[PDB]
Amino acid sequence: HQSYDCVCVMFASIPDFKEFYTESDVNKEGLECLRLLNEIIADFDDLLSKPKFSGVEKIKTIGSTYMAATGLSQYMHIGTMVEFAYALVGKLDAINKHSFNDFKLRVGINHGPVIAGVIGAQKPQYDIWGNTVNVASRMDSTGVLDKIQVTEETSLILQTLGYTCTCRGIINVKGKGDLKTYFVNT
Amino acid sequence: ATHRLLLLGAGESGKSTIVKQMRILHVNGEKATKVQDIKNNLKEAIETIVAAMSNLVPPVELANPENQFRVDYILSVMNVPDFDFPPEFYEHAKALWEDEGVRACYERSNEYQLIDCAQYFLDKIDVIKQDDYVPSDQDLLRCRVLTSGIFETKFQVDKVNFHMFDVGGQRDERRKWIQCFNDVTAIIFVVASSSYNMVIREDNQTNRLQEALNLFKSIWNNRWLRTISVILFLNKQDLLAEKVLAGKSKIEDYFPEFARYTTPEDATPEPGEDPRVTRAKYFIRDEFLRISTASGDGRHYCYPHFTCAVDTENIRRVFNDCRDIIQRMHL
Amino acid sequence: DMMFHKIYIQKHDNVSILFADIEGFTSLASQCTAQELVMTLNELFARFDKLAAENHCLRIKILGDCYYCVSGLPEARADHAHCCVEMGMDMIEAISLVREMTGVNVNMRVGIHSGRVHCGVLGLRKWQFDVWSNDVTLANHMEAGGKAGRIHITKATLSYLNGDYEVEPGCGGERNAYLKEHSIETFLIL
Ligand SMILES: Nc1nc2c(ncn2[C@@H]2O[C@H](COP(=O)(O)OP(=O)(O)OP(O)(O)=S)[C@@H](O)[C@H]2O)c(=O)[nH]1
Ligand SMILES: Nc1ncnc2c1ncn2[C@@H]1O[C@H](COP(=O)(O)OP(=O)(O)OP(=O)(O)O)[C@@H](O)[C@H]1O
Ligand SMILES: C=C[C@@]1(C)CC(=O)[C@]2(O)[C@@]3(C)[C@@H](O)CCC(C)(C)[C@@H]3[C@H](O)[C@H](OC(C)=O)[C@@]2(C)O1
Ligand SMILES: [Ca+2]
Ligand SMILES: [Ca+2]
Ligand SMILES: [Cl-]
Ligand SMILES: [Mg+2]
């Protein structure tokens, strides 16, 4: 297992889901809730097989948080991740139509050096580590619904590729301090 | 031998009643709590009518301005939490309900949000006020309490098992529906047939029937419901005829396509039924069937029934037509 | 199966959910380099993995600095409480040696609840066995509302313990709002 240099990490969680989760005899003690979640994630997995998303490598899923990365295979890989993150919205919206719900996805996207590999000799599973990731996650959680939050670096890169950015303000990243953040325009 | 039925339909559509009817028909201290509920229905029925009187366009005036004070009594108690329901209340209520100007307001009710049981309870106030009052079965049927959440009710019919799931018809309630989508025998979809001249509680603008149709189209074309048939319940059939025969408000004025419509050949009208009613009730059914023909492809079908939910004599009948359908619609 | 996707999930009662996090993770990140960190992280969680197999815990996932297993799975166990307790013990011991090797204040913060779970996998691509329920959600908050180098247990986790370990007032309501607003009586281990 090896290191890398320019990997684009995206976290997309679903804040509205934790509320929607119930445990009652009617929903078979939270099974039906987890059943819709399956349908949603499975819709998100139906995007990786697409051709323009062949570069997207899904890492794992934290509860309702979908975690993926591009560039594990110049900066076109950062743009892809956005077209992907857009796509999840189309997939999460689709569900809403049929499921009479109002889920909104919240997207944090960062980039930089990461280390990718296997951890533990029990069940070997693929995972990426380092600062780049930690920020990616921290930008999701401090994000706004229907909006993609990006760092100052990513702000710039997307501006070359024709995406416009609106400054969120400043964030206290645990260990990296105050820093400027951005939203891509719908 | 166990079937799980799920009751869907917009708010006030009739779901809650249908279950009540099953308790009547096929099931077995407790009612004293419901007596309170019935009184509540009464309170808010009259208090809503009076409140509407001024905000209506044009406004409606009392036929006896003596009643102005009673009108003031009603609005003074409108929001009072645990109301004592004193004998004053009933006296002033009847007085107003007697007042012709107040009745004129009720006769224009479709222009504001008013429960279905208003007239029914108001007409029997001297019955309700008694301290040893016991509600009739029909009184239990007509008593309106909004359902929030999912409530299962099991029962047995000729050694066959049913699981009925009552849900909330309103929009913030439609999210919970999902939990009953998997492993369902069929949908019972209920519709306020009579509510063609009305808007919804949710936003005071969207037409109730037009809402029910769009909600239906959602269910009929749902990704998790592709193989489930939907037993359509066109409810409030009494109230429809009442409105059609009254002819005060018209259908072609809310749904202009009705002007075109003529009555179908396969018409099976009830004995002594006015053609006008026949023409109206089947038009409504046909609007719904246009959604059950565009998609489905013989993977799931639709079974209409004209139903009056507060008619136990009609519910046995229609639910018997349904038992016939399910016996082969689990094979 | 033809309309809903196939669900690979099943209910499991009488199980005990251990959650463990690292106090002083960023302060350690500050000393070593990107790689030097992953070595220390992989070494600890490989170390952790062995202990779980002995202490009859089935490890679920590793979420950065978050390690969490659960005894009572894959198959039922009457030890299910005692295992997690013995697990956290070994874990606070397992961090010790690796902490002394760095010479900086790093520690494990443990949290355990009991009860019922659902377990299995979600989606289609990239399956990873996971658990879900309020009891998991509670267990998680126990770790969050935990204290450094101590094992944070619930009212339910003492009634599966049969009182073999000596406990003391937890006061979890003051360290976490979910714990407070649900009036969970918490305890600590001696
Ligand atoms: N006249 C007449 N009244 C009816 C009929 N069906 C139901 N009602 C009345 O309408 C009222 C509303 O019906 P209800 O059963 O509460 O709708 P709902 O489906 O439960 O509405 P919700 O719980 O989703 S918000 C009830 O008080 C009932 O008595 C009918 O066929 N004819
Ligand atoms: N690979 C990953 N998988 C899942 N989550 C991750 C990953 N990497 C980082 N995270 C997230 O990074 C977040 C930051 O951790 P946190 O700040 O709590 O650690 P800490 O510095 O030890 O602080 P504390 O001592 O208060 O717990 C975590 O909540 C975690 O969910
Ligand atoms: C997905 C289901 C649900 C409702 C229930 C559940 O058990 C969780 O998955 C746990 C607790 C649980 O799966 C254990 C890990 C972790 C990461 C702690 C989860 C998250 O906090 C989830 O919420 C998030 C943020 O996705 C949460 C709470 O969500
Ligand atoms: Ca942490
Ligand atoms: Ca930490
Ligand atoms: Cl309706
Ligand atoms: Mg109801």
Same domain, B231 and B298: yes
CB B294 within 8 A of CB B278: no
Q: What is the CATH number of the domain that holds B289?
A: 3.40.50.300
In terms of C-beta density within 10 A (0-12 exposed, 13-18 middle, 19 or more buried), how is residue B249 classed?
middle
| Beta carbons of B182 and C2 less than 8 Å apart | no
Q: Which two tokens stand for residue C103?
A: 């010479």
| Residue from A131, A144, A114 nearest A173 by CA | A131
| C110 beta partners | C20, C151
- Quick one: B237 and B174 in the same domain? yes
Among 3.40.50.1860, 1.20.1250.20, 3.10.290.10, 3.30.70.1230, name the CATH number for the domain at A1-186. 3.30.70.1230
Structure resolution, Å: 2.9
**What is the Cα–Cα distance from A105 to A95, expressed in whole angstroms?**
12
B53 in the same domain as B12: no
Helix axes A152-160, A76-99, angle to 10 degrees: 100
Residues whose beta carbon lies within 6 Å of some atom of ligand 2: A 62, 127, 133-134, 137, 174; C 21-23, 25-26, 63-66
The β-bridge relationship of strands B230-235 and B186-192 is: parallel
Q: Examine the domain organization and report whether B177 and B44 are in the same domain.
A: no
Please state whether the peptide bond connecting residue B87 to the residue before it is cis, i.e. omega within 30 degrees of 0. no
CA distances from B70 to A56, B97, B321 (A): 71, 11, 49
- Residue to mutate among B150, B166, B179, with most A CBs inside 10 A, is B179
Cβ atoms of residues A100 and B175 within 8 Å: yes
- For chain C, list residues whose CB is within 8 angstroms of any CB belonging to chain B: 2-4
**Regarding beta strands B2-9 and B186-192, do their DSSP bridges make them parallel or antiparallel, or are they unpaired?**
parallel
Location of structure tokens 């779901």: B15
User: How many angstroms separate the CA of residue B2 from the nearest CA in chain C?
Assistant: 20
Residue at a domain's end among B90, B111, B146: B146
Q: Which pair of structure tokens corresponds to residue B139?
A: 């009184």
Q: Which of B123, B146, B169 is the last residue of a domain?
A: B146
Query: What number of other Cβ atoms are within 10 A of residue B239's Cβ?
Result: 16
With beta carbons less than 8 A apart as the criterion, state whether C105 and C184 touch: no
Residue B314, phi-psi category: left (phi > 0), alpha (psi -120 to 50), beta (remainder): alpha
- List the single residue in A with minimal CA-CA distance to C10: A31
Q: How far is residue C119's CA from residue C87's CA, in Å, rounded to a whole number? A: 20
Q: For chain B, count helices (H), then strands (E).
A: 13, 6
- The H-or-E segment that residue B95 falls in is helix B87-98
Distance, first Cα to last Cα, chain A: 38
What b-and-e string marks burial along C87-124, b requiring 16 or more CB atoms within 10 Å of the CB?
Answer: bbbbbbebbeeebeeeeeebbbbbbbbbbbbbbbbbbb
* B184 in Cβ contact with B4 (< 8 Å): yes
- Residue B89 sits in a domain whose CATH number is 1.10.400.10
What is the total count of domains within chain B?
2
| Alpha-carbon span C123 to A41, nearest angstrom | 5
Q: Would you say how long chain B is, in residues? A: 331
Are B261 and B116 within one domain? no
Structure tokens at B129: 């006020």
d(C-alpha A186, C-alpha A163), whole Å = 10
In the set C17, C21, C92, C189, the catalytic residue is C21
Write the CB contacts of C71 (distance below 8 Å, at least 6 apart in sequence). C15, C16, C18, C55, C56, C57, C58, C77, C79, C80, C81, C83, C84, C87
CB of C166 closer than 8 Å to CB of C190: yes
A137 is in an annotated binding site: yes
DSSP state of A153: H
Asked whether residue B123 falls in the same domain as residue B270, the answer is no
Structure tokens at C7: 């669900």
Determined by X-ray
Amino acid identity at C185: E
Domain ranges of chain C: 1-190
What backbone torsions phi and psi does residue A149 show, to the nearest 5 degrees? -95, 130
Query: Under a CB-based contact definition with an 8 Å cutoff, are residues B248 and C28 in contact?
Result: no
Residues B209 and B159 occupy one common structural domain: yes
**Using the beta-carbon criterion (under 8 Å), do A45 and C7 form an inter-chain contact?**
no
Task: Please tell me the distance in Å from A162's CA to the nearest CA on chain C.
Answer: 31
Place of tokens 């009076």: B50
Tally DSSP H helices, then E strands, for chain C.
Answer: 6, 8
Q: Could you say which of B122, B146, B170 is where a domain stops?
A: B146
C-alpha angle B268-B272-B277 in degrees, rounded to nearest 5: 65
CB contact (8 A) between residue A120 and residue C45: yes
Say which CATH topology domain C1-190 has. Answer: Alpha-Beta Plaits (3.30.70)
Per the CB < 8 A criterion, the answer to whether B5 and B164 are in contact is: yes
DSSP B179: G
The angle, 0 to 180 degrees and rounded to 10, between the axes of the packed helices B275-289 and B208-220 is: 40
Whether the CB-CB separation of A59 and A67 falls below 8 Å is answered with yes
Cis peptide before B275 (omega within 30 of 0): no
Domain that residue B124 falls in: 32-146
